[PDB]
Amino acid sequence: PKNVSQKDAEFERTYVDEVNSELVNIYTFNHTVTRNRTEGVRVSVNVLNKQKGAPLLFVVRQKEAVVSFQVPLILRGMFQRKYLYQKVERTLCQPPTKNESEIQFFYVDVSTLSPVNTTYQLRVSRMDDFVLRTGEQFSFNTTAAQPQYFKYEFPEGVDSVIVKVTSNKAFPCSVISIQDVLCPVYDLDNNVAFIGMYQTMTKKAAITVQRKDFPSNSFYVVVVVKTEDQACGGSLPFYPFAEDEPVDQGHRQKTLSVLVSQAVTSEAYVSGMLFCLGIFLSFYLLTVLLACWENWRQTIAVFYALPVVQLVITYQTVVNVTGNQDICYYNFLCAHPLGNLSAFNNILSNLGYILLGLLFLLIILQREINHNRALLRNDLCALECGIPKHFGLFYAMGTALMMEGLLSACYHVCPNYTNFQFDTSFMYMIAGLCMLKLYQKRHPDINASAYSAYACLAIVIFFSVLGVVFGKGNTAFWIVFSIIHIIATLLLSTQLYYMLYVDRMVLLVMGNVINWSLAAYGLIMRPNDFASYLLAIGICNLLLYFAFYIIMKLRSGERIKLIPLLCIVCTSVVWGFALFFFFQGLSTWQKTPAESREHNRDCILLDFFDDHDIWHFLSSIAMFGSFLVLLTLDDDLDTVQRDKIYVF
Amino acid sequence: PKNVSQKDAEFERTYVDEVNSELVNIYTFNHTVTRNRTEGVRVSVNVLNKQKGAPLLFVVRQKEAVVSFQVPLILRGMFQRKYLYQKVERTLCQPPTKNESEIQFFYVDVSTLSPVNTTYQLRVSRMDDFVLRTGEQFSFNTTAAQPQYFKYEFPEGVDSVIVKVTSNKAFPCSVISIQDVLCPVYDLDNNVAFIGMYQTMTKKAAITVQRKDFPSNSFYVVVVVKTEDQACGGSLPFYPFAEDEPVDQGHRQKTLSVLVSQAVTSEAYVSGMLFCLGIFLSFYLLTVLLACWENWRQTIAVFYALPVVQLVITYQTVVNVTGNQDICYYNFLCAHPLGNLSAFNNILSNLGYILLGLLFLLIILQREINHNRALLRNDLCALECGIPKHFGLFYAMGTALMMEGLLSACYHVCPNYTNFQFDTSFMYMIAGLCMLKLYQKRHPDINASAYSAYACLAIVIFFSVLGVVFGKGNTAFWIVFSIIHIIATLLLSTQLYYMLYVDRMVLLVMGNVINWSLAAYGLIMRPNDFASYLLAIGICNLLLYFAFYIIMKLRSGERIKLIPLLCIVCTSVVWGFALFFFFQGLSTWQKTPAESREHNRDCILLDFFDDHDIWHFLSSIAMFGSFLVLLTLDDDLDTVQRDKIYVF
Ligand SMILES: *[C@@H]1O[C@H](CO)[C@@H](O[C@@H]2O[C@H](CO)[C@@H](O)[C@H](O)[C@H]2NC(C)=O)[C@H](O)[C@H]1NC(C)=O
Ligand SMILES: *[C@@H]1O[C@H](CO)[C@@H](O[C@@H]2O[C@H](CO)[C@@H](O)[C@H](O)[C@H]2NC(C)=O)[C@H](O)[C@H]1NC(C)=O
Ligand SMILES: *[C@@H]1O[C@H](CO)[C@@H](O[C@@H]2O[C@H](CO)[C@@H](O)[C@H](O)[C@H]2NC(C)=O)[C@H](O)[C@H]1NC(C)=O
Ligand SMILES: *[C@@H]1O[C@H](CO)[C@@H](O[C@@H]2O[C@H](CO)[C@@H](O)[C@H](O)[C@H]2NC(C)=O)[C@H](O)[C@H]1NC(C)=O
Ligand SMILES: *[C@@H]1O[C@H](CO)[C@@H](O)[C@H](O)[C@H]1NC(C)=O
Ligand SMILES: *[C@@H]1O[C@H](CO)[C@@H](O)[C@H](O)[C@H]1NC(C)=O
Ligand SMILES: *[C@@H]1O[C@H](CO)[C@@H](O)[C@H](O)[C@H]1NC(C)=O
Ligand SMILES: *[C@@H]1O[C@H](CO)[C@@H](O)[C@H](O)[C@H]1NC(C)=O
Ligand SMILES: [Zn+2]
Ligand SMILES: [Zn+2]
């Protein structure tokens, strides 16, 4: 009936043969495999002339598996789009060997149903690059039709490694997958996401793996290039080739470099543990040293937090079980896993807010007890002299700091677009509290009927959510928000003229100029999130009001003391550092995960903490400093009779 | 070299042939295909004696596709577990035909690498059951090794159909997938979730599809049986066969029945629209008729809502784009899509709370205006007679009803385990408000320093979240919660003895008995969520306090008027109906999605609204009634001087 040509073929040679409906070509390949060196093989097939009617069918038959594909290989698109690839390459799947040395045979089948003759080239090339080694970078080319996977074996004494792959050009989109060594290997667009840890990639992709997951002490690093870039977030093709005719691709190639490096040891966990406690417990012993010197000488939070916890549990469990690392916007280069937490470093860094808020609450309680005891002594200075001492708002600030730490840690177990508000929101409220804490301090009577906290929180939370949800700037909602910032600056000027002096006038004048300068950034439209900017503008406005109050106090003749000045300088320095690290942070939740991975950076401090972690440490130190400045700013006034002159 | 036997084979015959390393068997099948009748074919292969060394390799070659599998077919498990299936069946993928009548050939390749002879049976059977028809149920058997998919063509004039598949036994787990007719078909465990709408199934699985999605006016109903039941939530195998030896399966078969029925027309959308407005606008004209008769005769919500909206947008978009219907716990039998909302009926039913809360707010505003005008008249009865009129808490109840409607609609766009609190929570707060609204009404002086709302809300929200999050009852946290309910009943008795009369004593006595009866359900512990029970216990306790207050009023000699009595009877009837529908609701968020689909039920009213929707309509009517009873309960007292006797 049909003539079949069973021919013996050497390994590394390009075989150009003709096949039609009558002919079937059989290739027999014999190779020697060894347990010590794995060395997987790669089958390359190219169809020189395109057969529109019937594709050429290739079958690769091994001892324990069969891989079959059709060339030209037609792949799916997002909207009924077919992409045609005339070169297909696949690495053959090699099962583990029981003996020491084998002589294994695998047969390649070539056949077609098209009556006309079609020519092809078939070359099976041995891969000496199959095994990956620690600290060695391999650059290779892969295409949607040619997927490449490599094997890494765990060196003795290594319990976890990170698989980082970098590309010079963002596109085409790709999916790096880490799979156990149990054959077959899922290196196709349809089954790549079936098992293992996978994440889309444009320029960077880092996956941490551990020996406990893989009993065989080895894994496969499978890289599959997506046909379309929409998942990576780049662009959506809308033209290509119309209707049934498949688009011709294959000119799109992705060049990558896999580097498998040993993950940080348990020493970094201990050193990070000690650094976190050591810095903030230094403040604890410092204030006890400060206290001992003096003695010898003389609901909204809970409502905010519950959905946070629910989202935490569900999302972290989903990421752990499914392996879809695209869900959480971690810093995969610096994310360090402990138990079920993929990013322990961020949560650990969030301990600064908690500890410093607790310490500030203790300081407030001590001051309140001392003031109450002084009142019990019926001292005239405590009763009727100095700025009215109100500790409850200070308690609110301390509780706000502690709960900001809690909420930000709960957010940072899995930073994700569905949680961006949870980090930045309490920070603006604490700033919004430090805002008008001074105003209440100088004008306690105005605070009697203030009714401002709920309004401020509602305003900021409304502003910081729907604008992001609806869009990222429709050329430009963020320019509209810059106009809103301008009218807010006008409202600040309106508050100014309601408040008297030429120096005050000019001070708020360059305050408005500073706000507009910031509004320019709010132009070239807020590339990041308002969430970050609201905190930034709020903190900048808070520092401006700080300076306003200080210049007021110096102008009125009230002299700032040594402790307020030292706290002021420390707060400024630390605020500046915090701002620098806050500014360095960019992207994250707003961008797509593949585009978000591009900005990821390695660890900076102690091989454990990233830039954001440093921001958490610094912010808490700065905010503690701000609270302390507020606590001690009017100390000079307290030691003297209440001012006869009307309040500023 | 090797002897290949190209033999011509008829279609429906069991071919028993022997194959070894030397032999390769070639089968040529010729069949006639037509455009009007699709008629896809099915290839069955069974390997009689198991070959431990080398599996038997089968290749099916068609004009435009090649399907190749190995028998025995080894499939993956959750934890390095291999399941061996000795019978593999696959339907061949048929591309669309350009001519009218074709004579298409497809070749089946059988080969192995094992030196020893192995026997097999190969039978290719024509499927006259490929095409699905509306209203016709097909019962078929499928296995993890044998996946079955069927084609449904849209009849002219039908724009949407629902694909419902039912099984008599829950297990094994399965994945029904709906895919477009563009070949190949992804009927394997690894690639089934690649495209289309898929959902796991134990007993029921309903998928709504629309003509706009599929330009070809047809789709493939792919059913794949999972090897393990953990995703369906049943059990986790921990024994089976140890180490490398693959477990032998194939005794596990799933029997299903696919019924494709035409979805509800646009008439149900209009009728559901009219019924929703018609019922609640009847209350609007009724109270205007009531008002005209008299005239002629004479922040926590916003904080709760923002994460809700964010979760809405992300989850609904994810379900729409990925096709993973397991995420949202819809009522897929009664979920009716409108635009991007998969379940429009629930959101539409949630209009009752909004409209009735707005109407109650208008009634409160009218009463407040009338009372203020009467005070302006300096009437002694308004100034110093009757129960003190406090409209602000009534405003709180009305706003709570409106926001409960809003939040419950936002929840019901995608009911899901990460949103269960959002529906039930405001309802207990409204009940917790109706709780002690009467107490404030009789004892306004106690409410001056109450400070109870925040405490009650914190208690209920704490109770209703962490208990569910940590577990579903560890034999049993819900028995522990029943003990908590017992101590709460003891606290209620403590409140009783603080309050005087033997009748009051006995009344709270069977009130405690009723609570304990409810606690027994809290036993055979909470198959249901506490969330449902807290609402139920709260509403039952609220009705108990209602009856307590009414019996008090009748005992003191104060006669209830006609309107309060009619409102009381209507509220009871409607509360009873609401409770019945609330009780019928079960499962949902707590159980796994495959187990949740088992309890799904078809639409009851107007072919548009389910039982839960009826609960939304009834609850709002009952709660409006409760508010009205509270508003008019003391009307008799108002028309007379303030009671000299001390308040109850
Ligand atoms: C592998 O297959 C062939 C024949 O079984 C042999 O490989 C070469 O084949 C051609 C002759 O057909 C020549 O290049 C050489 O004479 C063969 N040997 C080598 C080393 O090139 C070879 O005999 C087979 N190898 C094994 C291990 O069976
Ligand atoms: C990946 O593809 C690029 C693009 O073709 C290769 O770069 C070319 O390599 C050929 C080698 O024959 C050179 O002649 C060209 O000058 C190169 N073009 C450049 C560098 O722009 C690259 O070699 C490929 N990498 C691998 C590992 O095959
Ligand atoms: C299909 O293939 C075979 C041979 O090409 C034919 O089908 C039958 O084959 C055997 C003889 O080898 C006998 O059962 C009959 O003589 C054949 N015909 C029928 C109808 O059974 C048949 O000729 C081929 N059909 C077509 C349309 O090409
Ligand atoms: C699905 O599998 C069941 C279980 O084997 C089949 O039920 C049996 O069918 C055979 C037919 O040869 C009967 O002899 C048995 O008595 C049946 N056992 C029962 C009903 O318990 C069922 O027929 C299969 N369905 C299909 C469509 O093949
Ligand atoms: C038979 O097939 C082989 C394959 O090359 C070869 O001998 C020849 O092409 C064929 N002989 C015929 C068709 O007579
Ligand atoms: C290797 O496999 C062959 C094939 O059966 C067997 O004869 C031989 O004993 C094996 N080698 C060892 C060391 O067991
Ligand atoms: C050649 O293969 C065919 C297949 O059945 C048959 O003629 C015979 O088994 C073989 N002849 C030999 C091995 O001499
Ligand atoms: C059917 O296909 C054959 C094969 O080329 C062709 O000759 C014939 O014209 C086609 N029929 C029609 C109606 O076009
Ligand atoms: Zn943070
Ligand atoms: Zn509901």
Curated annotation (Swiss-Prot), chains A, B:
<feature type="topological domain" description="Cytoplasmic">
    <location>
        <begin position="526"/>
        <end position="531"/>
    </location>
</feature>
<dbReference type="GO" id="GO:0009749">
    <property type="term" value="P:response to glucose"/>
</dbReference>
<comment type="similarity">
    <text>Belongs to the SID1 family.</text>
</comment>
<feature type="glycosylation site" description="N-linked (GlcNAc...) asparagine">
    <location>
        <position position="36"/>
    </location>
</feature>
<feature type="glycosylation site" description="N-linked (GlcNAc...) asparagine">
    <location>
        <position position="416"/>
    </location>
</feature>
<feature type="transmembrane region" description="Helical">
    <location>
        <begin position="344"/>
        <end position="364"/>
    </location>
</feature>
<feature type="glycosylation site" description="N-linked (GlcNAc...) asparagine">
    <location>
        <position position="320"/>
    </location>
</feature>
<feature type="transmembrane region" description="Helical">
    <location>
        <begin position="273"/>
        <end position="293"/>
    </location>
</feature>
<feature type="topological domain" description="Extracellular">
    <location>
        <begin position="553"/>
        <end position="562"/>
    </location>
</feature>
<keyword id="KW-0238">DNA-binding</keyword>
<feature type="glycosylation site" description="N-linked (GlcNAc...) asparagine">
    <location>
        <position position="117"/>
    </location>
</feature>
<feature type="topological domain" description="Cytoplasmic">
    <location>
        <begin position="584"/>
        <end position="612"/>
    </location>
</feature>
<feature type="transmembrane region" description="Helical">
    <location>
        <begin position="505"/>
        <end position="525"/>
    </location>
</feature>
<keyword id="KW-0732">Signal</keyword>
<feature type="glycosylation site" description="N-linked (GlcNAc...) asparagine">
    <location>
        <position position="3"/>
    </location>
</feature>
<keyword id="KW-0812">Transmembrane</keyword>
<keyword id="KW-1003">Cell membrane</keyword>
<feature type="glycosylation site" description="N-linked (GlcNAc...) asparagine">
    <location>
        <position position="340"/>
    </location>
</feature>
<keyword id="KW-0813">Transport</keyword>
<keyword id="KW-1133">Transmembrane helix</keyword>
<dbReference type="InterPro" id="IPR025958">
    <property type="entry name" value="SID1_TM_fam"/>
</dbReference>
<feature type="transmembrane region" description="Helical">
    <location>
        <begin position="391"/>
        <end position="411"/>
    </location>
</feature>
<feature type="topological domain" description="Extracellular">
    <location>
        <begin position="412"/>
        <end position="449"/>
    </location>
</feature>
<dbReference type="GO" id="GO:0051032">
    <property type="term" value="F:nucleic acid transmembrane transporter activity"/>
</dbReference>
<feature type="topological domain" description="Extracellular">
    <location>
        <begin position="634"/>
        <end position="648"/>
    </location>
</feature>
<dbReference type="GO" id="GO:0061178">
    <property type="term" value="P:regulation of insulin secretion involved in cellular response to glucose stimulus"/>
</dbReference>
<dbReference type="GO" id="GO:0005764">
    <property type="term" value="C:lysosome"/>
</dbReference>
<dbReference type="GO" id="GO:0051033">
    <property type="term" value="F:RNA transmembrane transporter activity"/>
</dbReference>
<dbReference type="GO" id="GO:0005886">
    <property type="term" value="C:plasma membrane"/>
</dbReference>
<keyword id="KW-0458">Lysosome</keyword>
<dbReference type="GO" id="GO:0003677">
    <property type="term" value="F:DNA binding"/>
</dbReference>
<feature type="transmembrane region" description="Helical">
    <location>
        <begin position="532"/>
        <end position="552"/>
    </location>
</feature>
<keyword id="KW-0472">Membrane</keyword>
<feature type="transmembrane region" description="Helical">
    <location>
        <begin position="450"/>
        <end position="470"/>
    </location>
</feature>
<dbReference type="Pfam" id="PF13965">
    <property type="entry name" value="SID-1_RNA_chan"/>
</dbReference>
<dbReference type="GO" id="GO:0035650">
    <property type="term" value="F:AP-1 adaptor complex binding"/>
</dbReference>
<comment type="subunit">
    <text>Interacts with adapter protein complex 1 (AP-1) and AP-2, but not AP-3 and AP-4. Interacts with LAMP2.</text>
</comment>
<feature type="glycosylation site" description="N-linked (GlcNAc...) asparagine">
    <location>
        <position position="30"/>
    </location>
</feature>
<feature type="transmembrane region" description="Helical">
    <location>
        <begin position="563"/>
        <end position="583"/>
    </location>
</feature>
<dbReference type="GO" id="GO:0000902">
    <property type="term" value="P:cell morphogenesis"/>
</dbReference>
<keyword id="KW-0325">Glycoprotein</keyword>
<feature type="topological domain" description="Extracellular">
    <location>
        <begin position="313"/>
        <end position="343"/>
    </location>
</feature>
